[PDB]
Amino acid sequence: MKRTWQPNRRKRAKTHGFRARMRTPGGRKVLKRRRQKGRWRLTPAVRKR
Amino acid sequence: MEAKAIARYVRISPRKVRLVVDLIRGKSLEEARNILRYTNKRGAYFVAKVLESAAANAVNNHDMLEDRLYVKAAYVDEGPALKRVLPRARGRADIIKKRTSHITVILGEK
């Protein structure tokens, strides 16, 4: 009965991604911390083509 | 002498041939096959391979007589299980174990 995942593909890219992490002064900490965590290979690129 | 035959890594359960292998202790081999053809209970098909392997071993390689052989001391032992999951109604998952078996028969002369 609509159990709260309900996928869409432009919403994956317009909130998560590269152009949404390299804009804000608090979101560049996320990339600069996942590049030295122990090298997350990466999560947010689940999107296609 | 002391003809041996072992069926190893055959998957049924080790308590569903304790019902069947107890019917062929102390019998002769001409009458352990007729008691085992018309028996029911799948599990009595795997035991009807190992006597017909042990008969060919005792005839060919170990050089005994042919029709004087009686089945002595047949038994079955355990085997490594393997686990899978069943989902069970509000979350909680369960583990069932599908076990294997080792049937062995030794065979001797009267």
Partner: protein, 57 residues
């Protein structure tokens, strides 16, 4: 909700199971041949009661 208590012994786990032993079948020989058979059926190697009805014409 009706859950048990103390786990049963080996000596009484293996006393219920004393009564589950199964019987061998009953066999007689086909009289036209020389083998076994369950003693009220058509014989699937030698053929009949009185008149064939089976077995590979």
């Amino acid at each position: 909700h009706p859950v048990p208590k103390k786990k049963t012994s080996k000596a009484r786990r293996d006393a219920r199971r004393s009564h589950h032993a199964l019987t061998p079948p009953t066999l007689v020989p086909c009289p036209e041949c020389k083998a076994m058979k369950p003693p009220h059926t058509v014989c699937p190697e030698c053929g009949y009661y009185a008149g064939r009805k089976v077995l590979e014409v």
